């Protein structure tokens, strides 16, 4: 039913030497997004208890 596009296949999928650098940049951005989400959730939950909150409070 759902099917990968031919023009998108001929560019990023037909050769491994083009597929692998695309894989590495996607891996970089996926790690950045996961880091951002985990850090935002942790800092939101534990607000007011961290050391940086005390330091920014003393300014």
């Amino acid at each position: 039913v759902m099917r990968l596009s031919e023009a998108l296949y001929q560019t990023f999928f037909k050769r491994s030497t083009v597929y692998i650098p695309m894989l590495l940049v996607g891996a970089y951005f996926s790690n950045e997004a996961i880091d951002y989400a985990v850090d935002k959730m942790w800092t939101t939950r534990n607000k007011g208890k961290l050391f940086s909150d005390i330091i920014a409070e003393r300014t």
Binding site: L23, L24, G26, A27, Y28, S30, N31, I34
Partner: protein, 157 residues
Amino acid sequence: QTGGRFLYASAARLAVLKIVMSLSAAADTMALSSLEVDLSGVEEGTTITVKWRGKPVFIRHRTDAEIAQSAEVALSELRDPQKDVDRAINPKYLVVVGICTHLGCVPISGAGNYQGWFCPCHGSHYDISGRIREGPAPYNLEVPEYRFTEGQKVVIG
């Protein structure tokens, strides 16, 4: 399949970096890269050796005759030319790291034909200012980063 392979590549890189960054220098190794030395307990004409990062650093209270002799050394005779004013801000107090750039040996103060430093490993010779005079050492002895303290102290690093 590409979406899973993104996380596969990320996990492989993270595991490899966690394995490699365990042979790096520990926290107590990093904390022991600093040194403060009192110059009131230094006599004139005497070379003291201190442990700065495991490297023997020669601190010699240079006499005025030694300062004049180091200033009288021409840059032509030096294999690596550098004036004595370009190494130490104060010509009296000299802070020189005693590691050969040739292979990594330690010179001996108070021995040598130039009344300076003689390296016993391969015949390398140094003057009173840390400049190459004879031998297979191709580069001058390094002067570390240090600043003068008002209470007759020198902090290296």
